[PDB]
Design a binder for this molecule. Structure first.
Ligand SMILES: O=C(O)C(=O)[C@H]1CC[C@@H](C(=O)O)C1
Ligand SMILES: O=C(O)C(=O)[C@H]1CC[C@@H](C(=O)O)C1
Ligand SMILES: [Zn+2]
Ligand SMILES: [Zn+2]
Lengths: 18, 338, 338, 18
């Protein structure tokens, strides 16, 4: 569990959210 | 360097020349330029390494796009247009500015209609102003009929097969990018896979692999400039950022019809060539494949980056204040791990 | 200092004197010595601050214990006896030695019967040897009838009420400690609450609050000496451990009948007085109260310690190798948070 | 969840486990 927690990728990119 | 400037067909001379490239402190070697039918191209994408594909026809119907065509046809929706008094359009998340009230961005976002962008651009050129604009807008349903038809005519067959072959997630957006000559987007990495489709003009792309994290010094995760390098490429502070003296880039200049695979987590610095006129690009952002079921050790660089990001996020939440993350980390390491 | 040496009843003179205390680099102030009926004593325990209680009768039936009585009555079980050629009995976890094959402990553990401990002690004294012994053994069911009766006669009424009043968890063990004069247990903290009941001889106890983490430099969590200070109190390396120049201790000398509350996470350095003969202590370790339902900010020092420990544990697991924890932490901070 | 995860205390003391 904890390992998969720390390995989880985000999805942020250089485009401003509204 | 990027390799010899490509010579245009019909004896139209060098597309660009080295005098149009900005001068930086680090060496580079060229990103391969290959046909999409070349097995080496598939090998690089599969191994999450960059490649320029010269013949995908990914955005072939958009190659006729210019400001006149777009203004006539792209509709009356709002477009995000950034303005700066510098060539550097450093990205920042407006939503994180509360965490860092001392951060004063050098670029500002203004919403306007496409014709107002063309007019502001025209005002600047006539008056000889130094103000710079960079339109950066996600394509959406408000675009006009002819843009819809052009978009439908992208090579979805080819890119859909890439998405499937690589196990990627959904297409999240297509960013339309229209910049002035000399515009720079400073080095940063994204947490999505990217096919970067050049339409008009020429962009120099300098990439750095995820294992150069130590050399490129991203801002803190809670800072507005999360994922962007703190190093001023035009004046690097080697006292603060000593391992920037070890950075080595992968370089190319993409022109109309080229597609650059920018793999997830790869750093990239993008610049519109000096004296090259306006540039137009459309990108294709895909969510990456999920974490594999079985973890193999030792971890890859991008997995350590994912871990570091999550440690910063969790500490910010647990400490109740992102400003306490640094002090706790320093307390953990000083005289213990350093 | 510890305060004026207590004068024994019946005009038997000072129990001890300052010449029997080792010399260190930092200032101290005294831990309060109070009656268990003093509301200030309850106030300190409730606020997880140390206090010496002079009249609990917690181990009253054990005050008659000496080597002859214990040998006759403590049974034929095994006792852990540490041996060292130095006065410092630095604790280490044998089970973590695999992570750090370069760690060479200066004390060794040998299992023996109680009569063999008494005999080894006697051999050393006669031969004038410099070898030191420290018996450290959890009390268990193998003890003889008279020890059982003595143990049943501890003041369970008083300590059970403390456990209940403070919301602590279970009594996990009672450690029997028998040391030679001059023996030192170097500074460390424990993750349990502790009532430290002195039986024979005198021990100088120097405590440091959890907010002095930055000054005391615990080993890495995966090191055998997890929770112990890396600073050699007898020769502090101020280049490696500069904030040890800021440490300030809380000091007392406990004698027979005294009970010291050592709160969970408080650092403590314990030494058997020079030329004071053997010392006997029994402690009472309790699991701490659970994490509260509602977290109040900003966090207390002991909560930040708990977080730092868990970050180290999680990274060691996720990276698959505890040796990679330091390098990842340094990569996170260098030029980013420092 | 994550906050309570990071706040969870251990119970280690200076007594060697077998
Ligand atoms: O496509 C990306 O990954 C980006 O970061 C975009 C925003 C900076 C843009 C540029 O072409 O100057 C590209
Ligand atoms: O009681 C504790 O918390 C301990 O750490 C024990 C082991 C070192 C011992 C000593 O009295 O020298 C006490
Ligand atoms: Zn990007
Ligand atoms: Zn202890």
């Amino acid at each position: 569990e904890v390992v998969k927690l720390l390995l989880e990728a985000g999805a942020d990119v250089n485009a401003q959210d509204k | 360097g990027s390799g010899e400037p490509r010579e245009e067909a019909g004896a139209l001379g060098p597309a660009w020349d080295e005098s149009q490239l900005r001068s930086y402190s680090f060496p580079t070697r060229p990103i391969p330029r290959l046909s999409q039918s070349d097995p080496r191209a598939e090998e690089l994408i599969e191994n999450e390494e960059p490649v320029v594909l010269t013949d995908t026809n990914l955005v072939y119907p958009a190659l006729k796009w210019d400001l006149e065509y777009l203004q006539e046809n792209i509709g009356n929706g709002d477009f995000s247009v950034y303005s700066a008094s510098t060539h550097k359009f450093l990205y920042y998340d407006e939503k994180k500015m509360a965490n860092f009230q001392n951060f004063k961005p050098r670029s500002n976002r203004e919403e306007m209609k496409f014709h107002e962008f063309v007019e502001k651009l025209q005002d600047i050129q006539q008056r000889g102003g130094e103000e710079r604009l960079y339109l950066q807008q996600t394509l959406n349903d408000t675009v006009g009929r002819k843009i819809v038809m052009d978009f439908l005519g992208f090579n979805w067959n080819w890119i859909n097969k890439q998405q499937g072959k690589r196990g990627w997630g959904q297409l999240t957006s297509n960013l339309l990018l229209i910049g002035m000559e000399g515009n720079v987007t400073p080095a940063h990495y994204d947490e999505q896979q990217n096919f970067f489709a050049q339409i008009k003009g020429y962009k120099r792309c300098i990439l750095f692999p995820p294992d150069q994290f130590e050399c490129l010094y991203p801002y803190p995760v809670h800072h507005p400039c999360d994922r962007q390098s703190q190093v001023d490429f035009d004046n690097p502070d080697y006292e603060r950022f000593p391992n920037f003296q070890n950075v080595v880039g992968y370089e190319t200049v993409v022109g109309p019809g080229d597609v650059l695979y920018i793999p997830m987590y790869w750093w990239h610095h993008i610049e519109s060539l000096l004296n090259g006129g306006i540039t137009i690009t459309v990108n294709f952002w895909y969510k990456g494949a999920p974490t594999p079921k079985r973890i193999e050790y030792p971890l890859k660089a991008h997995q350590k980056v994912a871990i570091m990001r999550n440690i910063e996020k969790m500490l910010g939440e647990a400490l109740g204040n992102p400003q306490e993350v640094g002090p706790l980390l320093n307390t953990m390491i000083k005289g213990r791990y350093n």
